[PDB]
Amino acid sequence: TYKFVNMREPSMDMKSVTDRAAQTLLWTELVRGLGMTLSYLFREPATINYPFEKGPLSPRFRGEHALRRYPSGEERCIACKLCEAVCPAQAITIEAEPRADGSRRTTRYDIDMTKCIYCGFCQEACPVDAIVEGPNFEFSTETHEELLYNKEKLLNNGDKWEAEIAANIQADYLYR
Amino acid sequence: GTSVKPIFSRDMNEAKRRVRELYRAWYREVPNTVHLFQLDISVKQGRDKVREMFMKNAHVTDPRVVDLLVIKGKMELEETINVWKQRTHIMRFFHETEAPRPTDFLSKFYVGHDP
Amino acid sequence: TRPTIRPRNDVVHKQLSAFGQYVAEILPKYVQQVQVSCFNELEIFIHPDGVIPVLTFLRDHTNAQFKSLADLTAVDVPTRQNRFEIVYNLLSLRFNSRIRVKTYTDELTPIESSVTVYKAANWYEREIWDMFGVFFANHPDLRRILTDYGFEGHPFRKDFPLSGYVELRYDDEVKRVVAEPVELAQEFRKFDLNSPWEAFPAYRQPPE
Amino acid sequence: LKKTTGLVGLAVCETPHERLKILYTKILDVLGQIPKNAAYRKYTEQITNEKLGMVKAEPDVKKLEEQLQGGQIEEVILQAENELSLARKMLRWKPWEPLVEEPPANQWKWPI
Amino acid sequence: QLIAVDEKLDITTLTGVPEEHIKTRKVRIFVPARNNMQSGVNNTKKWKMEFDTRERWENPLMGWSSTADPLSNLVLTFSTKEDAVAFAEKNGWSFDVEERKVPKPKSKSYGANFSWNKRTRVSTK
Amino acid sequence: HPAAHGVLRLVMELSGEMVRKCDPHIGLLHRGTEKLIEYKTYLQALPYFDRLDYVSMMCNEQAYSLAVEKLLNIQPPPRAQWIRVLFGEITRLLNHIMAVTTHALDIGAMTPFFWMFEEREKMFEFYERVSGARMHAAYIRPGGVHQDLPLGLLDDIYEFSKNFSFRIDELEEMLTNNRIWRNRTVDIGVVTAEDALNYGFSGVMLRGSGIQWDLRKTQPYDVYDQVEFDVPIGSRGDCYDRYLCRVEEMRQSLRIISQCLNKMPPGEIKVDDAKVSPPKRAEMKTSMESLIHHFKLYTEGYQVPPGATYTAIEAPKGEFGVYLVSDGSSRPYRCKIKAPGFAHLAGLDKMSKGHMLADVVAIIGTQDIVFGEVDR
Amino acid sequence: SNLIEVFVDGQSVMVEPGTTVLQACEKVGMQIPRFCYHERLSVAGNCRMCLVEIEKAPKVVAACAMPVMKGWNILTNSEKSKKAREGVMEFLLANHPLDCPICDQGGECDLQDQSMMFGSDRSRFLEGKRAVEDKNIGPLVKTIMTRCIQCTRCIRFASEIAGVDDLGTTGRGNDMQVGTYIEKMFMSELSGNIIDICPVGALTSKPYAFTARPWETRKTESIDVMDAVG
Amino acid sequence: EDNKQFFGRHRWVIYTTEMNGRDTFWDVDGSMVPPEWHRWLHCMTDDP
Amino acid sequence: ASATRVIQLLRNWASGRDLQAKLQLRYQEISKRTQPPPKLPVGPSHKLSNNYYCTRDGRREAMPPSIVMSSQKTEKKAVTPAPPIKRWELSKDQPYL
Ligand code: SF4
Ligand code: SF4
Ligand code: SF4
Ligand code: SF4
Ligand code: FES
Ligand SMILES: [Mg+2]
């Protein structure tokens, strides 16, 4: 089922001919366009006062990565390396060994933030909610090297954003 | 018989003829390339490089492979004449930035594990 | 079966089988095989010499009218004597149908250009020549389309490395962009993912 | 009679019945030079005879369009022209001959 | 009409491969061994072509593994040994071919676990 | 160049300002996506299709998912299909806004761009609320969608859709009847139906020449056979008719969005087959089978039975297709991407014959070219 | 010859007398799923994963232990065989610990792979799982016996190949446990092989613990030089 | 907050003039917002 | 909108429409940023019995393509790949723009 967009014939009576001639000589549709712009002039603009006002986000927002802890302070990560296997950009590098107490923990956990595509597959693949994409998005640097995150940087990110991260996970975890 | 379909030439003689026409075209083009791209090399350097690129494949005995090499060389010439290439593309033939890698056994042994 | 399984369509399967038999009967000189897949797709495997006739027949015949060339591409299988598989996808608006035509070639055997049958083939053929190195005879203007100027090799060949052989950087001594042999600070990590247990018994091969 | 075909570049054809009769007769005459046991000849002759019989038995253009199922006899005329060109090309090619060559042993074997 | 070439296939000048990665490479053609951690044999069906291992060194900034040879991850799959040999020969690569190893057929007997006089009798189940 | 979309090198031979020859040079955005896909699993390969045509993300996701589902012989659940069609029409709205406004900007009318990019921002908010990403959602996956809709999303979509028509009306007041716009667009880049068919065109570039063809009508997918809409058809094959067709397509997309909002069913959002779709996180942390399947689906992926398919959809820019070849493993053997922009830009020289510089600018604008899909 | 004719999915196979159904199936390229069977160990027939249907026979047979009779048609992909495999995998996974992320066998686990290929995709087990205590058998083999599926491969290997009778089973029923029953160490020149034959992460390599996953390792086929055996 | 303003202008922050070590009378940025007020300010929640 | 009534009237006259009816700024009609939790039902395979996977295994029902006319190996009416497409019908909602 279809319709035509440009298949209408103008009427040839004297009234229509005079209307079209007056349109040509007096520029009525151009005045209509001017009126549309003038109408927009007196509308309230849609601009927000950044950085004092921020754009709306969601609990599902994928921002800066972070490594989480259990309420006791123990690391959630167990070096299963699922995030490394699933990473479409190979942005994660992991090395592990038994800890001094025999625990299964990482010794290297690096994310190349200039390789990352910020897809969130790593936090889907994680079985213990150890690695997350946080809500932060304002972390521009001045050198390339500052965007090569090691385990200390990610643990600091987790310790710094845990209050917001836990609330977002509490809001979202029943959809996952 | 081996029942192979030709590309352009029946045997090696017409392939050599096509090679000679391509060499003539490149040899004629070299001064125009030097002038247009504003290169610091001389016409002698460019013509020697054309000769070197032609002699890189001097061992080929298959007329079809020679035909494909002539096709690729004609593509490169058409790229050069129309200024589709830039100065960097032309200068990549000279490897002016890569350090000279030694050939003798002792230097390779000193530097690393490559044969 | 039920909810999680894709349903079948026997009517379309029978129609495609009948039309494949039709095409095979009309052109015995070039047609080597006809197939209809389980998801109702018709493939016709032809000899390389019949590229121009068969396509012409599929375009101009009253009962075919495959007037649209949706896609033309190549597939590289190194284990085959004829390395490259040339695939044409055709759409017929009159009969609301799609067909696939497949032929083969190697590194040194040219294929006939189809620009006389479909103009759209032009760039497609160029891309094949750019990406796999297959030469198309009587192409009006054959040259690289996707790769950089002066690029050596054909990157879509299976034996071409993923990162290539050269990389680019700006050199200040010569004041220009130069190309050098590739070095990677972190090497791409190869993964061995295939399970040692068979997944689909229906596709099991004879033990030779 | 019809103001436009609605397709850009496709002119409205006055007297389409005569044009179609001429085209179908030309197609049949070209097919007459193809071997009798060729599948292309018999199939195309069958469909051409069907369409010619429909054309000869219907004077109304709209009803002929409905019967032919061919979409607006101007495109039917174009399809007839395409069929004639293909018939001449097929007479040149002779694709009714046996297979040129078999493929190598495992040319079409998939997987691998 | 055909031209009847009579020389062995050689496409080294058309692949754009640098010289060093033709005459200095050694490719191994082999059926991969079964992973001893598992009993499945589905990965021991095809032939593989792989290249010789070159140097990897630690990256100074991150400790990552760095490489300089572009063929370190290239693995080719073939259905027969002869196909892989032909591919290597036409690409100008020196190769070593290792013959396929098949497990020999074995005589299995459950009742042997309960022999009257032979040593095959088991002491536990 | 402001009119070259950043990565197009159009080498033009000109006589005065009359265009004698157009030679498009592309590949300035060729990233070797199709070779990269061969080293990824199917789920890992999914996010490449977001970046193929980064004006219509979820439509490419849907095309890839349909190809993979056809090869897997599985069925997405009905609610997933309805969500797919709803977000595909939202994506069509986004794409047509971008196309029309950038076209007008290229001609010289820069004002409607700002009016319509606020609507684009609102649909980006919808994308982010459903997936957490404004553009590259990766939301549509083989088997269904990643997550269910959050509560209240449908109400906000209804609020946006009940007002989008007046924005379309304002754009139409600015452009449709303006004599400058008609002088710049009428009878520019005229292509015939036969030439359009032979040159490989699709979508509006076909329907502007009077060809009655829409893949959503003739070869429907998902639940497109359960919704009612009209297909705009042109008569002159020029830029003006294609502009009118795209505006009417936006209106029909609003109609389809209304139908999708009113017909959303309940149920699961991905196929209830844990060998293909990952289980819920609660089950993965409770049941042994769920944990094993999560582990294997996120390490190795799912094996796809061997075979080759060509799957196409009516993306907002034309027929978008994938020729996907599976060798039986969990990594695709081959993935050829068919982008309408490739064939459309291949015929730019043909459509520019007898025109001027600004006419060629308008023709590039009217072909609706994005070079991520052209170069890949 | 003395060969007899059998059929695998209707395909004729000539086999020597005494050949088992599993071997006859493998003569045509079909690997029957198995946990307790190893071709270099004595037949046990306790895991019951190799159960397969013989045509015109109401009961499935253990393909690893049952010799194939002349004229038998082995149906390896019938509904009966598939449902038997699903039931056996359900029983195997009923008590198995949810330890895949912390298990070194993850990614090279026969239990995982055969669950993915021959079992169902969900669980209907609504009870609590069993847990057993670990055994210290030395500094080479790490023991986490909750993952044990009681295939008794280690016992058979230690008794027959290594010549050490220090492993066995204690108790019965669901409480049957694999071990030594005393604090004893399995120090043999061939002991580490019990890590390879164990299909699960019950017996793992202590020096290798936690360091790598199977998919990220590159395999180099080489020769041992620690002795003159090669 | 001001609920009579349209979505986007209904919540805002007046930054401090003196953060950890630097003078922020003129040099302000969005990274100074602590995570709890970050969640409130970006409308990921309706509760301060 | 907080615009005065005179400016509102000027806006409506210039635009030619009632602007206040459809506003682009969506003050308060939108959903709350905090929502109650969902319950998210399960699929048809969440059953305790009559649920063997071999009866719902879509991947294992795929088979190699049917071979018609291998080359290795009357009436006979002519056929088409499918029945001819039916002519499209004009819209009843709005056939002409
Ligand atoms: S967000 Fe995606 S790309 Fe980035 S680390 Fe996680 S999985 Fe890798
Ligand atoms: S972050 Fe999670 S998925 Fe990644 S290694 Fe640690 S526990 Fe495993
Ligand atoms: S033995 Fe296998 S199934 Fe059991 S926890 Fe380890 S990896 Fe998982
Ligand atoms: S420890 Fe391993 S080999 Fe021994 S019985 Fe248990 S699962 Fe079998
Ligand atoms: S393999 Fe036969 S019962 Fe275990
Ligand atoms: Mg083990």
Side-chain angles (χ1 to χ4, degrees), chain A residues 3 40 43 60 126 129, chain F residues 130 136 148 170 233 281:
Chain A
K3 44 147 79 181
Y40 257 88
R43 294 175 203 202
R60 302 187 181 179
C126 197
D129 309 2
Chain F
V130 90
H136 290 325
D148 206 346
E170 289 163 354
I233 305 293
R281 291 188 71 89

Side-chain angles (χ1 to χ4, degrees), chain E:
Chain E
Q1 187 72 283
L2 310 180
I3 57 173
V5 305
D6 287 331
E7 187 54 65
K8 71 104 186 176
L9 207 45
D10 211 356
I11 58 159
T12 47
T13 42
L14 298 168
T15 56
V17 178
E19 202 251 311
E20 137 178 42
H21 302 297
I22 306 173
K23 266 125 173 43
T24 304
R25 305 318 299 248
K26 192 71 146 184
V27 297
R28 192 166 81 106
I29 298 167
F30 70 106
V31 177
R34 186 184 58 84
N35 181 14
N36 223 70
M37 305 306 273
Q38 291 186 268
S39 295
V41 302
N42 206 52
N43 285 328
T44 64
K45 309 282 197 184
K46 304 293 153 213
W47 289 80
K48 304 296 177 163
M49 200 192 264
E50 61 161 17
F51 283 79
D52 42 313
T53 287
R54 294 301 176 94
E55 198 213 333
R56 312 176 154 98
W57 67 98
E58 181 196 16
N59 173 59
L61 181 71
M62 293 295 282
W64 290 334
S65 189
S66 303
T67 198
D69 86 291
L71 293 165
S72 52
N73 295 305
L74 208 134
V75 176
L76 295 173
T77 322
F78 301 91
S79 41
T80 59
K81 168 182 66 170
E82 307 91 53
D83 291 318
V85 172
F87 196 85
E89 284 174 339
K90 75 177 181 180
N91 280 276
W93 287 315
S94 325
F95 61 93
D96 301 320
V97 167
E98 292 179 353
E99 293 321 336
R100 178 196 282 265
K101 296 194 197 304
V102 55
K104 64 167 69 173
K106 296 173 170 59
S107 291
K108 311 303 301 178
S109 176
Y110 182 72
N113 305 351
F114 320 103
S115 167
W116 153 245
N117 46 1
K118 309 283 109 171
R119 282 162 186 163
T120 53
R121 176 165 188 90
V122 306
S123 61
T124 185
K125 278 212 305 314

Side-chain angles (χ1 to χ4, degrees), chain C residues 22 25-33 45-47 49 52-53 56-57 59-63 65 67 77 79-82 85 94 102-104 203 205, chain D residues 39-40 43-44 47 51 69-71 75 78-79 82-83 85-86 89-90 93-104 106-112:
Chain C
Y22 184 80
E25 276 154 7
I26 287 190
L27 313 147
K29 189 184 176 182
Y30 301 121
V31 175
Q32 294 169 337
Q33 237 196 100
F45 313 76
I46 74 166
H47 187 270
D49 284 350
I52 294 294
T56 312
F57 170 80
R59 190 198 66 181
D60 273 359
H61 187 58
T62 313
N63 269 358
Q65 298 196 48
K67 269 134 162 292
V77 185
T79 194
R80 282 163 183 174
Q81 174 186 21
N82 288 297
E85 192 163 330
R94 168 72 51 227
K102 294 215 286 207
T103 190
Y104 52 87
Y203 296 84
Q205 285 177 54
Chain D
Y40 175 68
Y43 280 140
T44 319
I47 82 185
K51 283 181 206 299
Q69 297 225 267
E75 331 164 82
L78 178 58
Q79 190 42 231
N82 285 334
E83 185 67 66
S85 178
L86 175 67
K89 275 168 195 171
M90 288 267 296
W93 285 320
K94 305 169 154 53
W96 42 82
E97 297 170 4
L99 178 69
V100 171
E101 196 158 17
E102 295 285 358
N106 294 270
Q107 186 58 57
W108 297 121
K109 199 200 178 214
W110 193 254
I112 213 160

Side-chain angles (χ1 to χ4, degrees), chain G residues 189-200:
Chain G
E189 76 280 352
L190 304 176
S191 73
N193 297 286
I194 72 172
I195 296 160
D196 287 330
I197 66 170
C198 184
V200 287

Side-chain angles (χ1 to χ4, degrees), chain G residues 34-37 45-50 64:
Chain G
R34 89 280 306 267
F35 279 106
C36 68
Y37 173 77
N46 64 66
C47 86
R48 315 306 291 173
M49 194 78 186
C50 70
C64 66

Side-chain angles (χ1 to χ4, degrees), chain G residues 159-171:
Chain G
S159 189
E160 296 148 17
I161 309 278
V164 188
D165 267 350
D166 283 1
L167 295 189
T169 42
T170 57

Side-chain angles (χ1 to χ4, degrees), chain B residues 75-76 79 88-89 92 97, chain C residues 142 144 148 150 169 177 180:
Chain B
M75 271 157 191
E76 286 307 84
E79 241 157 64
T88 175
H89 295 108
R92 280 168 207 178
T97 292
Chain C
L142 197 80
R144 84 180 65 252
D148 187 14
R169 68 169 183 86
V177 168
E180 292 158 342

